[PDB]
Design a protein around this ligand. Structure first.
Ligand code: LPB
Length: 293
């Protein structure tokens, strides 16, 4: 976020050179933000086995409001600050974040947005993810990264965040386009919502659906700005108008913010409670499912 936008995307080549130049340290910290559904892949063990040299593991399980009923909700400012500071990240650190998802990117945009919603703009996503780091035979190690702790000051940037009450008001004001990044079946209500008890699928009334995976090429790279721009247009999403991205739990919604950011729109707000909180708090009349409800 800013007028001149920071490079939201860093290439593997760039990161490889910076690592051989011995640049990771207080000025450049790398984070593996991988998280996968319980029982599929083991994000921390994978990290411990192979990570880019000097990278730390960003634990989204830790860095969240553990007291919330809802899923992966932001920590407080102090919480974020202490966590990120123990990872050796200061306000001066360029933070590069990747994950090891097979699609090339899944949680890394969420952590990109987390740094940005806590006021830190020098954060980038590794374009192609650890998948392409690996595919290109770049250096990996199991060596422990033990950064010196740093002090980090986190300041919540409220316009990059939307709450329940704000999305509810928007049902009436319609001043924000609400774009849902979940896969089409979950949006339409034909596919069930995974990993929850008694959670129906469907979508908030008035949402447009832009499945996050459509922003990535088959190789795991971000599509070019041109292709992105065309996708928003084909979906009637106007990038000059307010946009709130939502999804299941505030995570893939960040892909809509990253893609919009690469198209010159820095201010997509994330409905962090997303469908998981919406279903649980909203009147049934505010959403629709093609399998009715
Ligand atoms: O996305 C699907 O349809 C399958 C379930 C995968 C779970 C994660 C993806 C988006 S919410 S958690």
């Amino acid at each position: 976020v800013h007028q001149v936008l920071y490079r939201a995307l860093v290439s593997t080549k760039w990161l490889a050179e910076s690592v051989r130049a011995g640049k990771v340290g207080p000025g450049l910290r790398v984070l593996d933000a991988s998280w996968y559904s319980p029982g599929t892949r083991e994000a921390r063990k994978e990290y411990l086995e192979r990570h880019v040299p000097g990278a730390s593991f960003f634990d989204i399980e830790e860095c969240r409001d553990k007291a919330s009923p809802y899923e992966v909700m932001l920590p407080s400012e102090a919480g974020f600050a202490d966590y990120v500071g123990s990872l050796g990240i200061s306000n001066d650190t360029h933070v590069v974040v990747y994950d090891g998802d097979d699609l090339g990117s899944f949680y890394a945009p969420r952590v990109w947005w987390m740094f940005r919603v806590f006021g830190h703009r020098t954060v980038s996503v590794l374009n192609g993810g650890f998948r392409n780091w690996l595919k290109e035979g770049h250096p990996v190690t199991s060596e422990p990264s033990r950064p010196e702790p740093a002090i980090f000051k986190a300041t919540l940037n409220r316009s990059l965040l939307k709450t329940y009450e704000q999305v509810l008001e928007n049902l009436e004001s319609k001043r924000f386009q609400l774009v849902d990044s979940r896969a089409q079946g979950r949006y339409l209500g034909t596919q069930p919502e995974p990993d929850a008890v008694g959670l129906d699928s469907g979508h908030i009334r008035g949402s447009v659906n832009m499945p996050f995976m459509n922003f990535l090429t088959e190789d795991g790279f971000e599509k070019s700005p041109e292709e992105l721009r065309a996708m928003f247009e084909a979906k009637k999403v106007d990038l000059t108008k307010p946009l709130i991205a939502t999804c299941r739990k505030g995570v893939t919604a960040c892909h809509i913010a990253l893609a919009a950011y690469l198209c010159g729109k820095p201010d997509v707000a994330i409905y962090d409670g997303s469908w998981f909180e919406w279903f649980h708090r909203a009147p049934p009349e505010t959403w629709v499912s093609q399998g009715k409800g």
